[PDB]
Amino acid sequence: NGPEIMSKLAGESESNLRKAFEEAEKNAPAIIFIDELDAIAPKREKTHGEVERRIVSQLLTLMDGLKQRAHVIVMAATNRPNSIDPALRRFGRFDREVDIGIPDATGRLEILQIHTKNMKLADDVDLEQVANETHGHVGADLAALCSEAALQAIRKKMDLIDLEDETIDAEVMNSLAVTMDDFRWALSQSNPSALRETVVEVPQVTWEDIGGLEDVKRELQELVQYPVEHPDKFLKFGMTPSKGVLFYGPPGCGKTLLAKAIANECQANFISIKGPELLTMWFGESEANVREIFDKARQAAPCVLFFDELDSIAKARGGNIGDGGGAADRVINQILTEMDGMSTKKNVFIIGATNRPDIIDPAILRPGRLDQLIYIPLPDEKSRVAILKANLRKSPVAKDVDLEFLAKMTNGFSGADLTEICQRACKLAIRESIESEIVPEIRRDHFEEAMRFARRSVSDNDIRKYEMFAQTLQ
Amino acid sequence: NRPNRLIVDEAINEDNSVVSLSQPKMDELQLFRGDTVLLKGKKRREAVCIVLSDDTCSDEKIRMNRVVRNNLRVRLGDVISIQPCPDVKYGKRIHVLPIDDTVEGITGNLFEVYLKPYFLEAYRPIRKGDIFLVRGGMRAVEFKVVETDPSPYCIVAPDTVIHCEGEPIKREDEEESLNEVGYDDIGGCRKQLAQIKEMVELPLRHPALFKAIGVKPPRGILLYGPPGTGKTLIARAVANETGAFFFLINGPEIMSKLAGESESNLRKAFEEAEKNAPAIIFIDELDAIAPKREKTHGEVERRIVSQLLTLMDGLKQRAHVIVMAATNRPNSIDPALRRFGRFDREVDIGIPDATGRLEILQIHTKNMKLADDVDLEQVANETHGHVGADLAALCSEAALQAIRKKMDLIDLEDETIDAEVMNSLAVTMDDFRWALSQSNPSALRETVVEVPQVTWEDIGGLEDVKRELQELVQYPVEHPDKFLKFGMTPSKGVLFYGPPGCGKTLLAKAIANECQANFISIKGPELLTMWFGESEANVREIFDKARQAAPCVLFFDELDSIAKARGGNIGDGGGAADRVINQILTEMDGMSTKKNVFIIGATNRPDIIDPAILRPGRLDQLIYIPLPDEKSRVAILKANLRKSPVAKDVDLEFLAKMTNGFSGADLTEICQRACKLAIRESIESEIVPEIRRDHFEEAMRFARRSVSDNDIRKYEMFAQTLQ
Ligand SMILES: Nc1ncnc2c1ncn2[C@@H]1O[C@H](COP(=O)(O)OP(=O)(O)O)[C@@H](O)[C@H]1O
Ligand SMILES: Nc1ncnc2c1ncn2[C@@H]1O[C@H](COP(=O)(O)OP(=O)(O)O)[C@@H](O)[C@H]1O
Ligand SMILES: Nc1ncnc2c1ncn2[C@@H]1O[C@H](COP(=O)(O)OP(=O)(O)O)[C@@H](O)[C@H]1O
């Protein structure tokens, strides 16, 4: 343990590092697990006092003092890869690295089942909702979440039973069952508080959640799927697979869905960097963190790395009017750099998305960075049907509702504009069944009400200004 | 289950002998209201009281004073045997003596100063050997019942006699003091006492249940808040409430010892507690011991941190202890202490608000008599920056300000001052008003978190929006079912817009009061502070307070303030993104949409607001609060003036149509200048407790409208883009 070795007297500790390993050499095969390594050897700038420096240098000697000696392994654990002294990382000492991430909704369910397996849940309890609804938790937070809900059941029920026992009865404790009402309470506590950083997972959304866009679903497949799944031809004919794609178009039309969909299609990891996280690096004047993203994407491979509203920094500085300067800025510069040094033979794949393609820096569109411009436009009447079908699967709509009539009612409605038309009806519905509480369907009279509030966010010039752009692409 | 057995419980009454049971519980026992009962608890003894009609209570459990809980040798969450003892009786003779320690330093007769106001018209059922308590004379004095008539079995009516010889006994180890701390001593804290009570309830009260079941209790508990908030007093109270040995480590104490002599003192401290289990180890100032982040200088200090870490997970089993540490700021601690298994559970004990300050003032004034004019409310309502320990000093100052007025001249020369004067000395409002003039008003000033007082009855007009807010806030917490059924996700926030002064800020505090949530207000100059100061890292610190104060409404006021400062319409060559509003969107997205925190922005310049805030999932719903109408301007003028009692010759509804585009702000000083005129003339002509129309038709001269012809319609030209 890290503190264990550092709480001892200086030189009494040196005993404890030394005699620890040959103790393991006498027992081989053996695994020496160093608990907190960055407590022992966090030397980069740290480096103060004679004793601490000596304990780092001691550990380095013991790592390559492993010569032969039969068979041991040294497994150390640390929070951040960067706190360690790089002299530990050198070959022969800690060469192999594994990244154990936070769990996602798929995995959280496994964790919850592992810790609830000794206790009986009620019939209503479905761990899914608990699993699906805790989006920031690590594993040890779910182990506390399950222990709270258990005692919330005891501080309801057996509290009154008042069994006075030096050994409590077996026949009541077994019989005590935990309801959903408890989990919903434990989720009200502070265990929801958990560590919040880059989400890395496999997106759930499949193509069946995307209406329309029949060409582009294919384009993406031939751009991503082939060069991993047919490496032969690209050697044969010789071409190099493109590194990335840039979506453009009007807002709300599904640029972001397509990205998560192709990641689910191919079972890769999806990393989303949203515009405000690029603007954070721009005001904060730290663009050194762009390098830290790619080194996560590299390590999470296969991955798709999705930069969303990539036009955000060029808008913040004024865009069309802008300042007297040009289109280079320090965050987008730092992307091009980390983009070039990336291995073109690995599986990482970059997707940008922007709805202001004119103000984008022309240096991104050169070959070898983002080659392929794809245009996702306002959907058509055939698609607006598919959109409305797609969104509403969540709520079961009645049959008197003719969507395809509502389709032609909407002209330039984007995939975003239609989604709240569905959602205001979901406000009306929930209202009246509460309103008239003092019916599990949705009726046309809802929609023709919400019709009043329908807006289009895309003007006459906006739609064509995009077209006046794509005509320069002929 | 033999349902004359009930659970003991705390008391909402201070009365020395009273029990609180609701209407059903006395009925299933089939018993009267003014009865004399009997209570047989653990450790074979008993006592008698007067029950009272209760309402709230619970299914079954008995609200009881700490005094009677102490005789019975019982503690909250234990059970007690009541059967009615309707047998009545009247006193002939009582013999009671107090104890030396509680009377130490006093002069003369005991009876009159206390017993004579005490036993009168109570008709209280004394029992023999009963240690009871009386307050007065700027202290508390204990009395025990020694030898008595028809034993034990007594009742005190004027026809009894009393006598006390004047030799006290020396109390023994078998009984526990009332000079110690209990939940009565704590005020302004209910939520946090709640949270803490059941974290420590089962493991302390019932250790063998965990020696059976395989569930793991919490070990570390960490308390927050600025100094003088009562952190030490809350941990010590709980320990003496459950009966667990309370060991106390101090930060400087451990750090003043020699290096390695200290290491002794951390080590031997815990197993000392392991030998005494159940035990609570209270670390006084933890950030004095282990403040390691950058701090980290010298070999010895680093070693003492690492020592404490080892002792926290060296708690493996070992039977049952708890470690409660207190610290000023959560961020000064070394994060290695926070990791699971060491200090996992955190409680935030905030500064008290006006509601709670009154409880604190009453707790510290309860041993002294206030004058009739004194109302602690004004003192409580008028100290807005004080923590609890400032009110404990505020009450001690006012007490001596009464002595350095009055008994200073009395010049009693005593080695033991007289009891008959000190009790008689009463404290006026004139003293409190002075103590509030001293430096104790100085106290710690940071984010106010409370429940707003203003209810809808303080808001005139705005009939739609009062509903809109209710369906936006109230439903998704109070009907989670449907949003699962139909599937929609509840909106996170609202954005008010409109003209200035029309009540955007009132609506916010009102819906927080409506729903009993906490209200956090971030005012525009506090956003501009972060913008000039170039530290937007503090936006993250607000939300982590709002998260922790949940249920909360987080109200950003004049959210247009940074866009105005950089020029707005003209502005600079740049666009609408800036670093503080950016940092809000970020912390907004990462927030749990299933928690109860709810965000309200307000702006009167909605055109210059960054369009990125209005996307779905951030602030969805624009609401427009306009200049009130003649029906409302009546309700406004009615609402403001409740403070002062207006006369009947004043026709407001005539004044209503006089005001056209007067906002809710413009009308408020029309009421206020009349309040200047009034106060003037009654001083002016001093050398009338009404307000007369001649005031108003004077103030009419000074009426202005702050909203021009274009301003009102420019807002409308905005809302027409919203069709
Ligand atoms: N083609 C589509 N199929 C299904 N849903 C869509 C489609 N286009 C838009 N939406 C809906 O619109 C919302 C916003 O789409 P988004 O992916 O944000 O587009 P953009 O990234 O261009 O703004 C999503 O919630 C999605 O449900
Ligand atoms: N919330 C409170 N209620 C009642 N008394 C308080 C409260 N807070 C402080 N006091 C008074 O202040 C004194 C010192 O408080 P203390 O426990 O030292 O605060 P902390 O431990 O947080 O520094 C206590 O004796 C108590 O009488
Ligand atoms: N509808 C109203 N009902 C009661 N008082 C109002 C109303 N509108 C404005 N006021 C008064 O105007 C003052 C300023 O209102 P405020 O909440 O600051 O509005 P805003 O936040 O738009 O400036 C408050 O003191 C309040 O008493």
The answer to whether B364 touches B391, Cβ cutoff 8 Å, is yes
Q: In the block, which residue shows the tokens 């599937």?
A: B487
Nearest of B407, B382, B405, B406 to residue B394 by alpha carbon: B382
Domain boundaries defined on chain B: 1-88, 89-171, 180-351, 352-446, 447-628, 629-707
> Residue B487 annotated as binding?
no
CA dihedral B142, B145, B147, B149 (to 10 degrees): 140
Helix B463-478 vs helix A417-435: angle between axes, to the nearest 10 degrees? 90
Task: Please provide the CATH number assigned to the domain covering A198-379.
Answer: 3.40.50.300
A103-197 and A380-458: identical CATH topology:
yes
- State the distance from the centre of ligand 2 to the C-alpha of B389, rounded, in angstroms: 5
The answer to whether B661 touches B712, Cβ cutoff 8 Å, is yes
What CATH architecture is B447-628?
3-Layer(aba) Sandwich (3.40)
The answer to whether A443 touches A401, Cβ cutoff 8 Å, is yes
> Residue B571 annotated as binding?
no
Solving technique for this entry?
A: cryo-EM
Q: How far is B505 from chain A (nearest CA, A)?
A: 26
Pairing relation of β-strands B140-148 and B131-135?
antiparallel
In the CATH hierarchy, which fold is given to the domain comprising A103-197?
Answer: Helicase, Ruva Protein; domain 3 (1.10.8)
- Selected from 2.40.40.20, 3.90.1150.10, 3.40.50.720, 3.30.450.40, the CATH number assigned to the domain covering B1-88 reads 2.40.40.20
Give A319's contacts in chain B (Cβ within 8 Å).
575
At how many Å resolution was this determined?
3.3
In the CATH hierarchy, which fold is given to the domain comprising B352-446?
Answer: Helicase, Ruva Protein; domain 3 (1.10.8)
Give A168's contacts in chain B (Cβ within 8 Å).
208-209, 212-213
C-alpha to C-alpha distances, B375 to A238, B187, B366, B370, B386, nearest whole angstrom: 91, 18, 13, 8, 18
Nearest of B91, B92, B110, B93 to residue B167 by alpha carbon: B110
Give A51's contacts in chain B (Cβ within 8 Å).
299
Tokens of B144: 């025990």
Is B362 strand, coil or helix?
helix
* Residues near B126 by beta carbon (within 8 Å), at least 6 away in sequence: B91, B94, B145, B148, B154, B155, B156
A252 lines ligand 1 (CB under 6 A): yes
Nearest of B449, B460, B371 to residue B642 by alpha carbon: B460
Pairing relation of β-strands B46-47 and B131-135?
unpaired
CA-CA distance, B11 to B183, in Å (whole number)?
10
Task: Please provide the CATH number assigned to the domain covering A380-458.
Answer: 1.10.8.60
What CATH architecture is B180-351?
3-Layer(aba) Sandwich (3.40)
CA-CA distance, B614 to B591, in Å (whole number)?
17
Inter-chain residue contact A279 with B577, CB threshold 8 Å: yes
CA-CA distance, A260 to A262, in Å (whole number)?
6
How many residue pairs bridge chain A and chain B with CB atoms within 8 Å of each other?
137
Give B474's contacts in chain A (Cβ within 8 Å).
none
Q: What angle do CA B606, B567, B506 make, to 5 degrees?
A: 35
What is the DSSP annotation of B447-496?
Answer: ---B-----GGG--S-HHHHHHHHHHHHHHHH-HHHHHHT-PPPP-EEEE
Per the document, the length of chain B is 723
CA-CA distance, B459 to B455, in Å (whole number)?
8
CA-CA distance, A181 to A189, in Å (whole number)?
13
Nearest of A27, A23, A59, A22 to residue A41 by alpha carbon: A59
A250 lines ligand 1 (CB under 6 A): no
Nearest of B91, B78, B104, B87 to residue B35 by alpha carbon: B87
Domain B89-171 has CATH 3.40.50.720: no
In the CATH hierarchy, which fold is given to the domain comprising B629-707?
Answer: Helicase, Ruva Protein; domain 3 (1.10.8)
CA-CA distance, B225 to B348, in Å (whole number)?
6
* Residues near A73 by beta carbon (within 8 Å), at least 6 away in sequence: A30, A31, A32
- State the distance from the centre of ligand 2 to the C-alpha of B230, rounded, in angstroms: 3
The answer to whether A180 touches A125, Cβ cutoff 8 Å, is yes
Pairing relation of β-strands B79-84 and B37-40?
antiparallel
Tokens of A137: 């938790």
Please name the residue whose Cα sits nearest to atom 20 of ligand 3.
B501
- State the distance from the centre of ligand 3 to the C-alpha of B671, rounded, in angstroms: 13
What is the DSSP annotation of B25-48?
Answer: HHHHTT--SS-BEEEE-STT-EE-
- Return the number of other C-beta atoms located less than 10 Å from residue B225's C-beta: 22
What is the DSSP annotation of A348-407?
Answer: -EEEEEES-GGGS-GGGSSTTTS-EEEE-----HHHHHHHHHHHGGGS---SS--HHHHH
- Alpha-carbon torsion (A385, A389, A391, A397), positive or negative: positive
CA-CA distance, B391 to B363, in Å (whole number)?
10
Inter-chain residue contact B212 with A277, CB threshold 8 Å: no
> Residue B233 annotated as binding?
yes
Inter-chain residue contact B302 with A6, CB threshold 8 Å: yes
Inter-chain residue contact A168 with B209, CB threshold 8 Å: yes
CA-CA distance, B266 to B250, in Å (whole number)?
10
CA-CA distance, A429 to B111, in Å (whole number)?
73
β-strand partners of A30: A72
Q: Which residue of A190, A414, A418, A441 to mutate against B (max B Cβ within 10 Å)?
A: A190
Q: Which ligand lies nearest the alpha carbon of A415?
A: 1
C-alpha to C-alpha distances, B251 to B221, B255, B267, B284, B288, nearest whole angstrom: 17, 6, 14, 6, 5
Inter-chain residue contact A434 with B482, CB threshold 8 Å: yes
Kind and range of the H or E run holding B95 = strand B93-97
CA-CA distance, A239 to A55, in Å (whole number)?
53
- Alpha-carbon torsion (A106, A107, A109, A110), positive or negative: positive
Q: In the block, which residue shows the tokens 């309860």?
A: B366
β-strand partners of B21: B53
Amino acid at B714: K
First to last CA, chain B: 67
* Residues near A218 by beta carbon (within 8 Å), at least 6 away in sequence: none
Pocket of ligand 2 (CB under 6 A): B 185-189, 227-233, 360, 363, 388-389, 392
The answer to whether B94 touches B160, Cβ cutoff 8 Å, is yes
C-alpha to C-alpha distances, B196 to A185, A382, B215, B288, nearest whole angstrom: 16, 60, 18, 24
The answer to whether B578 touches B562, Cβ cutoff 8 Å, is yes
Amino acid at B591: M
β-strand partners of B148: B94
